[PDB]
Design a protein around this ligand. Structure first.
Ligand code: CU1
Length: 153
């Protein structure tokens, strides 16, 4: 797993969130091009706990073209928590301790927010076509809705 992290101030977090290259319609975010840039955050201020936000949407379904390089940036903005972002082929419902191996791409547990800053990381992903899920592995979070769907085709 990706377990290397950097720290960002709030202006840096805002700058990064705006680099998501998706296009929104309803609760779907659609990506296009040779390399696509997904920027996800764990519980942005005021969004429902527990959830991921991508392109300002709660747990949206990501539509990714087959053959694209997927550059994921994951930011943990939720004070007191160490959320992860892990992609799996296993769908819901998830147990309190989700059983989702193998994790095809994703992170360990993130640093908890500290010192006025937020931990984030970047990883790359080259999926085969199919359906995937992005899931948090902190106990109980996926069971209470902290996941979303990815369609690569
Ligand atoms: Cu989480």
């Amino acid at each position: 797993l990706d377990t290397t992290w950097k720290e960002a101030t709030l202006p840096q977090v805002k700058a990064m969130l705006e680099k998501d290259t998706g296009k929104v319609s309803g609760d779907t975010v659609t990506y296009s091009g040779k390399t696509v840039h997904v920027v996800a955050a764990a519980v942005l201020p005021g969004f429902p706990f527990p959830s991921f936000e991508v392109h300002d949407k709660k747990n949206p379904t990501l539509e990714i073209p087959a053959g694209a390089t997927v550059d994921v940036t994951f930011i943990n903005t939720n004070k007191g928590f160490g959320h992860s972002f892990d992609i799996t082929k296993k769908g819901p419902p998830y147990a309190v301790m989700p059983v989702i191996d193998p994790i095809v791409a994703g992170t360990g547990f993130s640093p908890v927010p500290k010192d006025g800053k937020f931990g984030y990381t970047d990883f790359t992903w080259h999926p085969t076509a199919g359906t995937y899920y992005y899931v948090c592995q902190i106990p109980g979070m996926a069971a209470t809705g902290m996941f979303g769907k990815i369609v690569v085709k």
